[PDB]
Amino acid sequence: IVGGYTCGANTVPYQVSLNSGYHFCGGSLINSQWVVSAAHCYKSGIQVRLGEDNINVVEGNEQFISASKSIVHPSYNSETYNNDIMLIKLKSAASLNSRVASISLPTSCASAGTQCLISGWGNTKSSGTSYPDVLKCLKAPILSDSSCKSAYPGQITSNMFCAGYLEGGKDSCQGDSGGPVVCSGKLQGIVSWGSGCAQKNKPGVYTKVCNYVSWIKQTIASN
Ligand SMILES: N=C(N)c1ccc(O[C@H]2CO[C@H]3[C@@H]2OC[C@H]3Oc2cccc(C(=N)N)c2)cc1
Ligand SMILES: [Ca+2]
């Protein structure tokens, strides 16, 4: 997260870290057994880490649970990141508490200008590299589809939206991928892609979760 702030420990209790010996992507807990992330974060051997603030220090509210299965969206395209969403099942149910909590799925899509909260353990610099160990947060509005498509001609599908600030300075970044975009209490986006981080006229691009609620619900009920 570039241009954000320190969230405060466990104030985003649905935020998970995906760990394969090290943090490599964010995710969102959507019930006691399932996490939503980006398909481009797929790998084997995932451990889900819940209740995290400092991902390098055991602070006493963590739950580390291995994934028992992963399901990449059937139509995920790795070249374009169209349909950049995946579900991960926990081998055992998480113990839900005030620091480890699910986020609701949308009942409808969010409209432009709606404010959201984006969070993650990604790079905090727009040039060069610095990784925080505590969770970072950013408030950012959904941008109009026109501004989105203009910044990225021929690349935005109906499954993508942009959020952020055209002037630059504030964005998600590498290592934030898979993490949540929450607008009015609902998981409306997933950190997906962009151009650099926090560059002018290049806002972040996010998986449009509302389009996937039927697939999510049907997939978790059958697995
Ligand atoms: N539809 C396209 N033509 C497209 C889609 C994804 C794509 O993935 C690339 C570009 O962005 C991804 C990846 O390589 C770098 C990584 O950057 C990210 C990741 C996550 C967040 C951000 C951000 N600044 N908000 C940037 C490239 C082209
Ligand atoms: Ca920790």
UniProtKB/Swiss-Prot annotation:
The lineage of its organism: Eukaryota, Metazoa, Chordata, Craniata, Vertebrata. Interacts with SERPINA1. The keyword Metal-binding applies. PANTHER family: RIKEN CDNA 2210010C04 GENE, TRYPSIN-RELATED. This is Serine protease 1. Subsequent cleavage after Lys-125 leads to alpha-trypsin. Further cleavage after Lys-170 yields pseudotrypsin. A cleavage may also occur after Arg-99. Not sulfated on tyrosine residue(s). GO terms for molecular function: endopeptidase activity; metal ion binding; serine-type endopeptidase activity; serpin family protein binding. The active site is at 40 (charge relay system), 84 (charge relay system), 177 (charge relay system). One of its GO terms (cellular component) is serine protease inhibitor complex. Belongs to the peptidase S1 family. Is inhibited by scorpion cyclotide trypsin inhibitor TopI1. Its main location: secreted. Residues 1-221 form the Peptidase S1 domain. SMART domains: Tryp_SPc. Gene3D superfamilies: Trypsin-like serine proteases (2.40.10.10). It comes from Bos taurus (Bovine).
